[PDB]
Swiss-Prot record, chain A:
GO molecular function terms listed in the Swiss-Prot or TrEMBL record: nutrient reservoir activity
Entry's family note: Belongs to the hemocyanin family.
Glycosylated sites: N195, N465
Keywords noted in UniProt: Glycoprotein, Secreted, Signal, Storage protein
Name of protein: Arylphorin
Gene from which this protein is expressed: LOC113516268
Subcellular location, principal: secreted
Organism: Galleria mellonella (Greater wax moth)
GO cellular component assignments: extracellular region
């Protein structure tokens, strides 16, 4: 038995000029797996012709290329779509480019209706979501959470089977027996209790942390990161003023994703992330209970050999790529892809990031190439373990968890691969000169004490709408759709406050950063900062004004810069829209981790951690970064001061720095699977 | 484009007395996945009490054991059932025994209603099917074909997905487009065109023969063989007087299956069946597109290492089980399981067979054991590649866990080829047949002619409504018909004419076998090595008069083949006229006639026929109750039941070998099923 | 047994089994308390996956060290390996015979 | 894992060569777990308590 | 190799027969080693080139100097490049891998 | 002198954690039956005939 989640939603008034767009968007995402002939979009799309409106798109080459590809023929409906499938990738990229360059919202809506009526549902939804996120006239509206747009990618096969059975039966034949199987009929809706994956899917006791790696917020955060910074798009469209920092961002996000993951491994006593060799048997197995269009996801058997003949070519490329980077580390200063690079400069990080993502910015100074290959894509294909026939043949593919950004974080091999990549990047980082005392010491400021309230974690029920997973009848489409709600346990932490005491000789503006990190490693020994600098997670980052004398700063966890609130359901979105309000976090803070995942759980019911507090002078960001003020607090690199290796730890024993030891406890049931009828 | 299969069924009048029973049986098989409170059986099941009716069962120990097991609690509903799961098998065995020892049909019907109301659907359907097959009072009753009882085990995931979508939508939203996705609406029914598995599921070009290994009747034959002779039942209650020939039946059936598979491989140019080492890795990848309760079937990669950390114990057992057998071959005459065994005698075959099946007959002379092990079960577990867990409430299904899907996995063929290799090593002991036993003095086969041998693909329709869950309205009034229309192999009628000379007038037996002529390497196969690859196709008797004789045998009269089963609707239609499909009552355990010949080629594929004429001798007296499966007293597969050592001394005037060619008409491949190809 | 245990001579195997089972159970409890899981199983024809580098000496002679991935079946051990295997298989055969 | 030699006057000590140090080696626990698994396979014969 | 050597009563590392050098823990090191070797072979194909801001011509016997330094990773190899906080030695990595500690 | 072959009492319980480690106790009560006669010299290690 677990308590039910109840929370208040932060709301902001919506611009009256955007009341028409929002609705329209929400109308095109209803039952996107099906086309209803009775809807307006059906007629609009059926009658719309792209070429006749070629003047309504800013760029003309986009229209010509889209027309050429459409004449060549797109993929048929009712098939699995993945951005890693080359032909589908080209088609969806062309469609997205057509969407983005539409001169006005009316043309964009007409094109979206055309795409939904004529094109594959998956490509349509992907491109439409990306365009809504990136279009200028759609800034301010709210989109549904990814787990409500793709429910099948965020639940296991058993719950989906139950939902499909209920839909086919149009209710319960014997309602009294429903509760004994985890199905509750209440308030015109059906609630299905959902578990997490067990030892059948994960080996080596990793299932203990399933609740964390299968959490909807985790995968939704990864998908949001992909959507905001797609690898195939040019940086200028993505980030205008801070394009040169793209690689840095690539390093900052993944470094965080792994670190948190590592922390969870320490909470469950699983140790460090394994390392592997490409030319040796892979020891981590994976048996996902996931399916798309009833097609099972690929299963990787234990001791799978990656260097078979069929994959040999790919392997070679992978190896070569790695080798090349090492050679660059020996050169130090060189020219690659017609770009001059000096590794003694921190700025070079950008290039490094791009190099390991194989994104468009890496090939911006070279003529358009018909030959292109991605290290990440090849590694994902090799580790997916799908049959080679699936790869070779175009009209058939067996889906893998690594072929979608909504399910990549479920596979353990993802973490190992990106840990290898980050190991290479840190080997590069070893070049940079460590920060000196002059830059770390804030003369005149001393932190006297840091106090923290009790840190408690617990599981609570969370409900999310999964109606889009089923196919509806004509009558349901006409009158109203059924409501199938998945109720699952989720991790959460109680509110807590950090109190900091600071003595200042002078009055000035300062920047305060709060980080979280582990204390002991898998072997039970304390971790020195020289190795722990990469494992710290940045929690808070804010400005303050210090007056002469003593000062106290109380910072509530509900105000941390790098975390957001949980997304609201579609019905609540409609309720708020009818009253002219929208959720602020879903508007402009959706690219941040959920606040419920700040703290680890711990299998021993008590886990030690450490908090790091640093205060340094404030300097305003350069003016040109004006339209990015909401996301940049100062001009320092992301992760400062833990952005480069620490060589001499005694430089961090400054008056303006403080390390605190804290303990995280668990309240209630230690495990999340106590959700049966007799346990409730 | 392929022709549509239409053929009238050869029916026979049913005894009026059994009519009612037939009805009831069918009523218990309707929508077995769901329990309808409004049906008649519901009240009986909810009110029936077995203990109070303990006097209604002939045996009391069975009732006590079943009650003791039920006190502990059976498996929950809506869960995967497999006979290879120990606890589920233990429960289902007790349920089947309770069904089998019921005094009369009323008690059996009450018990079946109780089981359906309370127990797991899979266990209930399995036990009821087996009991109806075996119960004497139900003998002569027609049962639906296995592929209509478990449609999800005989079709891939895409077609089932389309069917589920149609069921959820309660029809088509945009009908005029469904045609482009292989979904046709017609005559109050929905037809779904289906493809066979391709290279994505099968590696090393095996998919070329997917039309054969995935054939519905090909797997239904194995399921019927399992049902008729189940490893966990004593010989007396399953076969009766043919209890000492159980191992012979096992060997014969498995050898015939492997021989037909090898013929298909040769026709598709795939070579011989690979051999493997347990301490080495299996080299047969398999990625089934199958699901039960949406739970995916286990997948195995191309290079799978069989000996891992969690399998060692099983591996060890397997190895030991093999080595012991080899030791027996060195001893010759020994005492095992309280039974004296002499390998010099042919009858010992029985023991050998049981030894390789670990059936109950192998342990009938030793005290009841609580330590149970099976070579085949461990081999299937190892080859399935499913994740290993010590929890009884969590399983990942594999094709080898069900007899309905076992033949879809090449590992099955490899494993049983290994087993039959051991059995042939044993067979090397037996003395070869002599001329006096083979030569038919005064009988010579002058000639043998055969008409053109033709194979093709034709559309076949089968009902797949049981795979979906119906609504209350559908249960109360009527459900829609979801029909799967898929290509299937078939052959045109042909006749074999045999011209014989015999001045002596006597009774004789004629056997006809079909076999290969060239191996995978393109060289002819000597009879000393080809004796294990010959498939018996005909076995009959004839009276030869003095002088010349001409025998004309039609392909529709061959002993070892039947006709295709029919859907439930036609069964009801015939029952309304007091008739039943005769071949679903007669010869319903044999292979279909459509699979008699391997698929041919445009140019033609070479094979050979072997015709053998020998003296007739009537089957023994005590063999009277089973005088519908045998024709004489000779062993199954005679004269190829033992190795041929010298082909010179085997050939006789009363034997004939002929070379024939099989041709293909129409499309060579079965995947031309698109809207634009029709 | 007579000179070591006396009247509890027919219960020697019971004592052996009980003592070793208790030792392994206590070790498993400690592993669970330290979050290390169950006791791994190994195959003789495969390699042991338990590294050990003892810091022990007798007469200054170092104790033997074993790496993480040690192949048990090498050129100089075959005979012993064979015996081990046989000794196991015979026992399994006994389980099939029951009374012997 | 000690070096193998046919000479009786030369030995490299191992933890498993002494009962004072046997329990320091995980291989001891693994080996005796295997042995007890065999013994429990034997124990499966016995009739359960009523 | 089973050395009977000890320092401060700490035994020297023992390398068992058939020791596998390419385990995950060492994989990084292995890669570096391999890369180093590969690089040299590439140089042999170039003949005349510039490495570490030093012009090298392999047709001249004098080039031996560079070659030697290249395989020792000594200070003279990096005399023409700015002081590097990143440094790795082929010999040291190979010694670590073969030591089996 | 007495009970010098048994485990020490200090190792009875596995090391715990600050939050607490879960385990269970099983208590069983059954009829008493005295050890056999010839078992007299060893009636310091046993309590019954089970
Ligand atoms: C997420 O994962 C978790 C983890 O698995 C799941 O939690 C499990 O859920 C299942 C099903 O909901 C639970 O099984 C049920 O447990 C019931 C509680 O039983 C307790 O009390 C009884 C005495 O009254 C004890 O016997 C039980 O255990 C003891 O006995 C068993 C006997 O086998 C031993 O094995 C144990 O070691 C104990 O000694 C518990 O202490 C239980 O009542 C219920 O049993 C009914 O159903 C089973 C089905 O097989 C029958 O065998 C049994 O005879 C009972 O008969 C009922 O059957 C059906 C209903 O199913 C109807 O005909 C009637 O209602 C009839 O009464 C069942 O076994 C399991 O305990 C639980 N595990 C936990 C909490 O750890 C979640 O379900 C899962 N969530 C989702 C959404 O998937
Ligand atoms: C069992 O397995 C087999 C083999 O895998 C499979 O057969 C294949 O079926 C697919 C259909 O699912 C076939 O694909 C279609 O082919 C036709 C015919 O193409 C030939 O002829 C044209 C000229 O007429 C040539 O240009 C072409 O190269 C071929 O030689 C096409 O007409 C189809 O094109 C339409 O659909 C495409 C998407 O699939 C679009 O890209 C294309 O533009 C066409 O669009 C049409 O529909 C749109 C949506 O309504 C509409 O907007 C358009 O205006 C237009 O009307 C299609 O490519 C394939 O060829 C078959 N292959 C073989 C070897 O037979 C079976 O289907 C399968 N069975 C089952 C039950 O699964
Ligand atoms: C789980 O998820 C499912 C699916 O997302 C949820 O189901 C959805 O619920 C919402 C809220 O109830 C639905 O939106 C509302 O729909 C009603 C009904 O609309 C229908 O009936 C109208 C007449 O009563 C009819 O006019 C409508 O047709 C018009 O609109 C369509 C386009 O949508 C257009 O093509 C037609 O030509 C018509 O113009 C339609 O047939 C509707 O009345 C609501 O509108 C109000 O709100 C909007 C927005 O504020 C406002 O603009 C309007 O003026 C009006 O005030 C509203 O749109 C949605 O349709 C449901 N989706 C499906 C597929 O059925 C479910 O609620 C979730 N459950 C949870 C979270 O528990
Ligand atoms: C495919 O299979 C389904 C299910 O087996 C078939 O539906 C079944 O059809 C039979 C015959 O029409 C029904 O039995 C009859 O029911 C009527 C009452 O409606 C009764 O008067 C008759 O005496 C007879 O018992 C049966 O109830 C029905 N089952 C369900 C669940 O509806 C279907 O006909 C099959 N289709 C084809 C093409 O074979
Ligand atoms: Cu593993």
């Amino acid at each position: 038995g677990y308590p039910q989640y109840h929370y208040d939603v932060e709301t902001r008034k919506l611009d009256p000029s955007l009341l028409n767009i929002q609705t329209k968007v929400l109308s095109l995402l209803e039952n996107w797996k099906q086309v209803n002939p009775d809807d307006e979009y059906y007629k609009i799309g059926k009658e719309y012709n792209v070429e006749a409106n070629m003047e309504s798109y800013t760029n003309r080459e986009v229209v010509t290329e889209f027309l050429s590809l459409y004449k060549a023929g797109f993929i048929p409906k009712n098939e699995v779509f993945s951005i890693f499938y080359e032909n589908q990738a080209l088609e969806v990229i062309a469609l997205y480019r057509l969407f983005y360059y539409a001169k006005d919202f009316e043309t964009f809506y007409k094109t979206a209706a055309f795409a939904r009526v004529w094109l594959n549902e998956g490509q349509f939804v992907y491109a439409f979501y990306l365009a809504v996120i990136h279009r200028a006239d759609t800034r301010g509206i709210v989109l549904p959470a990814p787990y409500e747009i793709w429910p099948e990618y965020f639940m296991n096969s058993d719950v989906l089977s139950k939902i499909y059975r209920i839909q086919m039966q149009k209710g319960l034949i014997i309602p009294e027996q429903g509760p004994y199987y985890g199905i509750l009929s209440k308030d015109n809706a059906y609630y299905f209790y959902a578990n997490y994956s067990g030892p059948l899917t994960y080996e080596d006791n990793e299932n203990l942390l399933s609740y964390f790696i299968e959490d909807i917020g985790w995968n939704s955060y990864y998908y949001y990161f992909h959507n905001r910074f797609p690898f195939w798009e040019n940086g200028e469209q993505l980030i205008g003023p801070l394009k040169e920092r793209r690689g840095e961002i690539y390093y900052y996000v993944y470094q965080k994703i792994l670190a948190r993951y590592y922390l969870e491994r320490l909470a469950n006593g699983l140790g460090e992330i394994p390392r592997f060799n490409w030319l040796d048997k892979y020891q981590t197995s994976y048996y996902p209970l996931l399916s798309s269009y009833q097609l099972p996801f690929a299963q990787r058997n234990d001791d799978y050999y990656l260097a078979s003949g069929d994959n040999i070519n790919d392997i070679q490329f992978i190896d070569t790529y790695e080798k090349t980077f090492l050679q660059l580390l020996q050169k130090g200063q060189f020219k690659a892809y017609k770009q001059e690079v000096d590794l003694y400069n921190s700025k070079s990080i950008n290039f490094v990031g791009n190099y390991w993502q194989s994104n468009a910015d890496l090939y911006e100074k070279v003529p358009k190439r018909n030959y292109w290959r991605s290290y990440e894509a090849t590694a994902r294909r090799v580790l997916g373990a799908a049959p080679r026939s699936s790869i070779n043949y175009e009209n058939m593919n067996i889906p893998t968890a690594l072929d979608f950004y909504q399910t990549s974080l479920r596979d353990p091999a993802f973490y190992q691969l990106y840990a290898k990549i980050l190991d290479y990047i840190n080997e590069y980082k070893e070049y940079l000169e460590p920060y000196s005392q002059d830059v770390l010491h804030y003369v005149g400021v001393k932190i006297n004490d840091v106090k923290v309230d009790k840190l408690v974690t617990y599981f609570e029920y969370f409900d999310w709408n999964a109606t889009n997973a089923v196919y509806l009848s004509e009558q349901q489409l006409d009158t109203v759709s059924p409501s199938y709600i998945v109720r699952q346990p989720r991790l959460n932490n109680k509110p807590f406050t950090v109190n900091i005491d600071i003595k200042s000789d002078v009055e000035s503006e300062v920047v305060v950063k709060i980080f979280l990190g582990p204390k002991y490693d898998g072997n039970g020994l304390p971790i020195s900062l020289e190795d722990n600098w990469i494992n710290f997670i940045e929690l808070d980052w804010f400005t303050h004004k210090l007056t002469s004398g003593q000062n106290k700063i109380a910072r509530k966890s509900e105000e941390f810069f790098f975390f957001k609130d949980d997304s609201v359901s579609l019905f609540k979105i409609y309720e708020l829209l009818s009253n002219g309000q929208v959720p602020s976090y879903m508007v402009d803070r959706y690219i941040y981790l959920p606040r419920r995942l700040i703290l680890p759980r711990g299998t021993q019911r008590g886990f030690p951690l450490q908090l790091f507090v640093v205060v340094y002078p404030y300097q305003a960001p350069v003016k040109e970064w004006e339209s990015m003020r909401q996301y940049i607090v100062d001009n320092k690199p992301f992760g400062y001061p833990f952005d480069r290796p620490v060589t001499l730890p005694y430089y961090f024993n400054q008056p303006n720095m403080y390390f605190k030891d804290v303990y995280v406890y668990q309240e209630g049931e230690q495990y999340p699977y106590y959700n049966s009828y007799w346990s409730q | 484009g392929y022709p549509l299969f239409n053929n009238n069924v050869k029916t026979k009048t049913l005894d009026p007395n059994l009519v009612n029973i037939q009805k009831k049986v069918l009523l218990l098989l309707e929508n077995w996945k769901q329990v309808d409170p409004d049906d008649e059986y519901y009240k009986i099941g909810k009110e029936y009490n077995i203990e109070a009716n303990i006097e209604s069962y002939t045996n009391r120990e069975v009732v006590t054991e079943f009650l003791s097991l039920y006190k502990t609690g059976f498996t929950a509903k809506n869960q995967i059932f497999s006979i290879y799961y120990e606890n589920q098998a233990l429960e289902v065995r007790a349920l089947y025994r309770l069904f089998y020892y019921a005094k009369d049909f009323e008690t059996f019907y009450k018990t079946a209603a109780f089981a359906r109301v309370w127990l797991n659907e899979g266990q209930f359907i399995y036990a009821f099917y087996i009991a109806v097959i075996h119960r004497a009072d139900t003998r002569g009753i027609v049962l639906p074909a296995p592929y209509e009882i478990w449609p999800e085990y005989f079709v891939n995931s895409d077609v089932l997905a389309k069917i589920n979508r149609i069921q959820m939508q309660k029809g088509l939203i945009l009908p005029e487009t469904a045609q482009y996705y292989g979904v046709l609406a017609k005559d109050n029914a929905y037809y779904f065109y289906a493809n066979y598995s391709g290279p994505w599921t099968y590696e090393n070009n095996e998919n070329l023969l997917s039309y054969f290994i995935e054939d519905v009747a090909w797997n239904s034959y194995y399921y019927y063989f399992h049902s008729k002779l189940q490893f966990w039942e004593k010989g007396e209650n399953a076969i009766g007087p043919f209890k000492e020939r159980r191992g012979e039946i096992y060997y014969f059936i498995y050898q015939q299956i492997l021989a037909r598979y090898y013929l298909e491989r040769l026709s598709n140019g795939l070579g011989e069946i690979p051999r493997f080492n347990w301490n080495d890795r299996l080299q047969a990848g398999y990625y089934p597109l199958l699901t039960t309760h949406q739970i995916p079937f286990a997948q195995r990669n191309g290079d799978y290492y069989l000996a891992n950390d969690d399998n060692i114990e099983d591996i060890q057992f397997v190895d030991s089980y093999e080595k012991t057998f080899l030791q027996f071959l060195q001893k010759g005459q020994f005492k095992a399981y309280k039974q004296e065994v002499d390998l010099y005698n042919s009858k010992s075959v029985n023991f050998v067979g049981n030894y390789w099946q670990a059936n109950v007959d192998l342990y009938e002379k030793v005290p009841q054991r609580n330590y149970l092990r099976s070579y085949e079960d461990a081999a299937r577990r190892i080859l399935g590649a499913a994740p290993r867990n010590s929890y009884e409430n969590l399983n990942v299904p594999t094709a080898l866990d069900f007899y309905q899907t076992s033949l879809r996995d090449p590992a099955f063929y490899q494993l049983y080829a290994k087993i039959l290799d051991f059995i042939n090593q044993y067979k090397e002991y037996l003395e070869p047949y002599t001329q006096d036993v083979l030569h038919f003095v005064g009988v010579k086969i002058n000639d043998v002619k055969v008409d053109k041998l033709v194979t093709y693909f034709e559309y076949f329709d089968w009902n797949a409504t049981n795979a979906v869950y119906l609504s209350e309205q559908q249960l109360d009034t009527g459900s829609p018909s979801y029909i799967v229309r898929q290509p299937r192999l078939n052959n045109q009628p042909f006749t074999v004419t045999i011209d014989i000379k015999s001045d002596v007038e006597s009774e004789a037996v004629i056997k006809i076998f079909i076999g290969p002529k060239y191996d995978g390497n393109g060289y002819p196969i000597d009879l000393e090595n080809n004796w294990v690859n010959l498939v018996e196709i005909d076995w009959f008797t004839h009276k030869l008069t003095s002088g010349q004789n001409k025998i004309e045998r039609k392909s529709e009269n061959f002993f070892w083949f039947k006709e295709d089963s029919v859907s439930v609707s036609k069964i009801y239609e015939l029952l309304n006229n007091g008739q039943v499909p005769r071949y679903m009552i007669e010869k319903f355990l044999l292979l279909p006639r459509r699979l008699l010949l391997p698929r041919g080629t445009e140019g033609g594929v070479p094979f050979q026929f072997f015709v053998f004429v020998y003296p007739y001798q009537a089957p023994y007296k005590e063999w009277e109750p089973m005088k519908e499966f045998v024709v004489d007293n000779k062993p199954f597969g005679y004269p190829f039941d033992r190795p041929v050592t010298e082909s010179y001394y085997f050939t006789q005037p009363n034997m004939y070998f002929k070379d024939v060619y099989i041709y293909q008409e129409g499309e060579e491949y079965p995947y031309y099923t698109s809207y634009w190809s029709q």
